Amino acid sequence: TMNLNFSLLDEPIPLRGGTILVLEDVCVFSKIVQYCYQYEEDSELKFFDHKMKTIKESEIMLVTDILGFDVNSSTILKLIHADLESQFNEKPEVKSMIDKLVATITELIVFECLENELDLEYDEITILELIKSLGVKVETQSDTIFEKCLEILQIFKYLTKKKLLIFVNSGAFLTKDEVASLQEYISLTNLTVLFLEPRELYDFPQYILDEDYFLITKNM
Amino acid sequence: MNLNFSLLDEPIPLRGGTILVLEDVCVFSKIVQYCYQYEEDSELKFFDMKTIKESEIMLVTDILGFDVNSSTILKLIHADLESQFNEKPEVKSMIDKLVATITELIVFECLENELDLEYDEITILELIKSLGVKVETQSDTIFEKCLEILQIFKYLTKKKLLIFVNSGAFLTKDEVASLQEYISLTNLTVLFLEPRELYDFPQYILDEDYFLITKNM
Amino acid sequence: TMNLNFSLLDEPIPLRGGTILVLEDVCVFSKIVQYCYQYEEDSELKFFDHKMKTIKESEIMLVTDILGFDVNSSTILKLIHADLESQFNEKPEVKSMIDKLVATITELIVFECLENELDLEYDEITILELIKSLGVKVETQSDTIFEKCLEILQIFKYLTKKKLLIFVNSGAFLTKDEVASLQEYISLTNLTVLFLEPRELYDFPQYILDEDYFLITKNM
């Protein structure tokens, strides 16, 4: 489906499902990593899907610091909250029930308000405020770089707008089993993930890359 | 408590409501002003005999423009409404149970969501915050708003005295009479600095001659 | 020129220059004061100039707390700064000189930057940053409600977009002399100012107002 293509490359590389990509040469390795952080419209490196429609900065999700990756970023949390709200909208028997419950709870407070001396006014209580007040956030149970990768994988999956995930030099932290559970999940869930590796990652189906930008396959 | 300074033979006593007329245009302006710039060694003094710090004094000049929806005041209102429920365990308990139901319907959405989500609680305080309860001021009459200023004043426990500058001019005798009753009832300490005599309530007067009188007792 | 007109009024009141306006009745007094704080499009009270073009919330400047009035509000300061900048633009021989001076001063710093280890980049230094850095602000010398009124008057004058000033119940703080110096300045500077007073302000030309909304003049 997806392509990694730029000037110095013979053929555009296929990014289909899980994909390990070795860049033997230290210089091509950094060049490519860095062209990744530097990804933008004006960029050396182009990623695009089958329809040749190019993946934008925003659609890529790039991880080098696996531990550092924040699963409860505000950006993620806003989305989750907004998402949980729209779940309600699609079950109208429950939004009705939420509505009745808030309407009632509101009166009971306004009751105390009327009771209070002050001329007190008020707005409404929204589903979002309830979710936000409840403190819904992503579970952080993973206590290992490996467990973490899976969570990053889960989240990547969860963000429908993030289309490609790139782990950079992540092989270093992963038993052959772990790498396989990962690729397992990635097959299972239909994720396009790229692993920019500096050396061969065990004996998994994977692509390699000369200092000359010549492309061999391996372990098929 | 007391108001004192150098020109006064003897300090002025501030229990509950205390109306102070200054009829010398220039002494009115000096005293209102000294009040406003009040500090540790200001020319003008206030005390219990421990002197009131500035921070323990609120001063209202512009009534309608005074913000009674300050954070500290909201925070206070809100904990007060909450605590109104601790007097009504019956209803509070229903609220706990209603909140539990919302919680459950939300957690169910949380499970049904692909992500492994955790959560905490929803508290009555959060519901109150969420509801955006605040004092309504936008339509007020000066009188209505004086009352609100008084009502919020009771909360600021830190503050010991509230001063009203030249508010009389805006008030019907009956309105003034209301606020006295309320001041008296709420065990509050309040001063109205006036240019002129305020109808016929008990009040103090200092003239051009600087002779301090007492009236309508 | 300007008019104070609303429903309960016989004739629209002329606001020309300084203007004292007594509202004998406690109720009409508050009603009117309050209709002032509550001024907006949907409002009881209308102010408009000669061309019957109505003065907006923003064009009025309403003072009850004379001491409290902040002459160094951010809003005032932004304007002053922006204004001082445009002074420069209109003296091109001086903007040239400012320009030469900054361009030079910049190099001398960039010089130190080049000298510094780090790859350091930089932007520019603007006239505004110079003004802001210099800490230009309005002088606060007035140590009396009276001195203050004059400063508020100066500022009112300074804001070309603020078209009417209303002092509310300010008479209370003002010797007959002071009131006169004020009206003096207001004549001198061409200001439209209104003094909502609850009682007669000495013996100055002024308008009075019945509990019935009947309008007499006085002291002409």
Place this chain on the structure above:
Amino acid sequence: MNLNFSLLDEPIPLRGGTILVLEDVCVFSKIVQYCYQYEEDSELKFFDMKTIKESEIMLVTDILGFDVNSSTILKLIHADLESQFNEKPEVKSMIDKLVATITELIVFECLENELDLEYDEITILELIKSLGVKVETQSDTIFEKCLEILQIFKYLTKKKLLIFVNSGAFLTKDEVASLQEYISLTNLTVLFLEPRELYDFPQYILDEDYFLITKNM
């Protein structure tokens, strides 16, 4: 200083540059990870014999994504550039005089303005702030940026050790060699946790057997 924990017969010594290879995939991951969650009683230890607090340790995993334009770092850069002038009184003095001229042309505009305006001074620090001097990163190579991380590291005096996780993979031997020279020259203390041997520099190795070796001395 030193890195120590339970599996090590004897602590590892951290003077200047110190490269530490962990070749057991699982011990690499454990140690990188322990580093990251380091605290008071973490499994992993660091000390002078007073242990380094977490706050005294900076850790780089994502090189290009690390923010060297932090407030604390800018604040520091800027006071350093200023102080570069105190070594050049001649030029500084011209700058004082140039600034005085701008000041004067501004004050003149201040007088010419209808309002009575006051003012303070313009300082070199303000000019530097205004100028928006910061480290340029936007075009960096990983190597270039390591260098900048090092260069800013010298400033944070609070921090005692900087750790680089698995940065080797990105670096030419000659690039690595550069950063060693610079570390050595700047009297800095630095650790590179590596999965594999880093070319042929002096470095420490811990294997699957957990046998600690020393190499290329």
